[PDB]
Design a protein around this ligand. Structure first.
Ligand code: 68U
Lengths: 345, 266
């Protein structure tokens, strides 16, 4: 630029921290999605020997998505929510890099390890995971921050290191235009499928209910094969677990946009034998346990009758032996493998 | 609503409530070319530029305020020499808009708004048309974000003001005048020096004095450093004396020619 000060431009150029100079991450790509690219990284100017995560954001410039992610992570600080450590802006290629502490594990990979093995574990690990998840979402909700995309894959867990066995919530769905769902269906609340125009705290809590069922059974509770928000098969699967909701169960269901569609497609008679009690009984979970009664409150059909994260944390489940621990693994050896390195091509 | 209750652990509070003497020391660079009166006249002018940009684009007041603060924070650190503030002003509106979630400003709409606003509402200060293309805004955006240390969530006095007037029960009587007085505080450094809620109490105090409402016991029922509130009241009252004695339209051509200018390369 001619009308930008040359001395100001070269001084800032002399002083700028460039990501390629500071970290080693070549050939250490560990994630690739809509979000862009994620690399496991070590620091070159070696003050510490910690592993870090480097997110290069999809596209260029400052997207509204990128902007809200930066704006919010810049303020949010809590042990159960992933921390932004630094932000590198690369002017030449117009790419944005974010620095986080590295989490070796997550619930997708962890639960898939139990699925694999058991097909051929520490007490309070399920309880601890649930508590720390509820603590993390509570922090966000209290700051009027919704997640909007909560699933096992974005519930990370720290490997060996000083924060051993701590949950780190990540990939918060920052930027949905007009806070709208309409602009895997397994974790989505029945209101979303019936056409709800906006995301809510209650929608986040349903997803936690689904993750809790999944930690207990090693099975996605609303598993379902494979536009507008109405999805027939996903509703059928919910009704196979929960049963079909009565008027007394969900008074405002009439107010949903896809209620006429539901009535047209579904009959109460079909699901008369079904209930969460029987589903959990079939997956070897006791219905008179405090574990079950909390799950039942998280997976309530009517969103206004779903308990808050605050009250879930207050459940006497978390006062029953075994207690939650800060280290989910409770000092026991981590049997889960380290992450796998991906390619550029 | 995002981060509403977190001011006391926020990046605004911990990095962007500055010391007055520190602020005045970094300003002395630009006071080699401008007087203290002329520099303030500059600030008042560009606050009106950003308001005008916001109104054209149909942004709500809070988004405009955030863009206003982005501007102030930038020039609290760096010279007017650094980047042309004709370019910075729409860049701040543009970055601030992206912090919001309801609707997006496009590129051609921003450059259209910058062009049209300066030609129709500010041709007393600018003979030639807005010369910058979109990629200039985009280059400038990166510098803005970096040099604000990625601090994008700004707290403003409007939210506490709404809370206070409803506490009194004088929304019809006081709110429009007090909200207007809050708008005027952005013609000053107040947002760099005091938490938002203190600015709002001061603005509501002045609205009471102008409308002759007695809230001596309501204000007494608060727990707050009243010396600091009076400090802010004095700044508001001094601003209205400048306003009186400042003809923005007659003066800004001459002042904008005094502004130190970006050095180009060889
Ligand atoms: C979109 N990514 C992030 O926002 C992010 C931010 C900070 C991180 C710190 N540490 C680790 C990850 C990590 C790495 C890989 C990986 C996952 C997470 C989930 S996954 O899809 O199962 N997979 C292969 C991180 N991810």
């Amino acid at each position: 630029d001619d009308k930008m000060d040359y001395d100001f431009k070269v001084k800032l150029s002399s002083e700028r921290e460039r990501v390629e100079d500071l970290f080693e991450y070549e050939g250490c790509k560990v994630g690739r999605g809509t979000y862009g690219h994620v690399y496991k990284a070590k620091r070159k100017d070696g003050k510490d020997d910690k592993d870090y995560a480097l997110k290069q954001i999809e596209g260029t410039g400052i997207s509204m998505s990128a902007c809200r992610e930066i704006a919010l992570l810049r303020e949010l600080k809590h042990p159960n929510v992933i921390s932004l450590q630094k932000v590198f802006l690369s002017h030449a290629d117009r790419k944005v890099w974010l620095l986080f502490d590295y989490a070796e594990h997550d619930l997708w990979h962890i639960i898939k390890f139990h699925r694999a093995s058991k097909a051929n574990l520490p007490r309070g690990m399920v309880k601890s995971l649930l508590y720390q998840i509820l603590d993390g979402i509570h922090y966000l909700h209290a700051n009027w921050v919704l997640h909007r995309d909560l699933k096992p894959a974005n519930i990370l867990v720290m490997g060996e290191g000083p924060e051993r066995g701590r949950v780190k919530i990540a990939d918060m769905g920052f930027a949905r235009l007009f806070n709208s769902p309409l602009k895997t269906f397994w974790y989505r609340a029945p209101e979303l499928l019936l056409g709800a125009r906006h995301y809510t705290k209650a929608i986040d809590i349903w997803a936690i209910g689904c993750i809790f069922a999944e930690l207990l059974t090693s099975e996605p509770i609303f598993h379902c094969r494979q536009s507008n928000p109405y999805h027939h098969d996903q509703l059928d699967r919910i009704f196979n677990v929960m049963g079909f909701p009565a008027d007394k169960d969900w008074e405002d269901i009439k107010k949903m946009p896809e209620h006429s569609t539901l009535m047209k497609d579904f009959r109460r008679n079909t699901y008369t034998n079904c209930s969460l009690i029987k589903y959990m009984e079939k997956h070897k979970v006791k219905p008179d346990s405090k574990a079950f009664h909390l799950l039942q409150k998280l997976l309530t059909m009517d969103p206004i009758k779903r308990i808050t994260s605050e009250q879930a944390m207050q459940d006497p489940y978390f006062l029953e032996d075994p207690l939650p621990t800060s280290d989910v693994f409770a000092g026991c050896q981590i049997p889960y493998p380290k992450r796998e390195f991906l390619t550029e091509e | 609503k995002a981060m509403a209750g977190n001011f006391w652990q926020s990046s605004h509070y911990l990095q962007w409530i500055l010391d007055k003497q520190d602020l005045l020391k970094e300003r002395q660079k630009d006071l080699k070319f401008l007087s203290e009166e002329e520099y303030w006249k500059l600030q008042i002018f560009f606050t009106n530029v950003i308001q005008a940009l916001g109104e054209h684009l149909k942004l709500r007041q809070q988004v405009i305020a955030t863009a206003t603060v982005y501007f102030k924070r930038f020039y609290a650190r760096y010279s007017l020499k650094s980047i042309d503030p004709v370019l910075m002003a729409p860049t701040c509106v543009f970055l601030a808009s992206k912090v919001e979630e309801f609707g997006v400003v496009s590129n051609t709409r921003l450059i259209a708004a910058a062009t049209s606003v300066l030609k129709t509402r500010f041709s007393y200060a600018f003979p030639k048309e807005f010369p910058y293309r979109m990629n200039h805004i985009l280059e400038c955006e990166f510098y803005l974000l970096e040099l604000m240390d990625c601090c994008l969530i700004v707290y403003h006095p409007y939210r506490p003001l709404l809370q206070y007037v409803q506490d009194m029960g004088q929304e019809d009587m006081l709110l429009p005048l007090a909200w207007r007085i809050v708008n005027d505080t952005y013609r000053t450094d107040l947002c760099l020096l005091y938490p938002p809620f203190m600015i709002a109490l001061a603005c509501l105090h002045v609205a009471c004095v102008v409308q002759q409402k007695d809230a001596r016991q309501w204000f007494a029922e608060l727990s707050v450093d009243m010396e600091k509130i009076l400090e802010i009241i004095r700044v508001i009252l001094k601003l209205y004396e400048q306003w009186k004695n400042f003809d923005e339209r007659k003066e800004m051509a001459t002042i904008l020619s005094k502004m130190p200018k970006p050095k180009p390369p060889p």
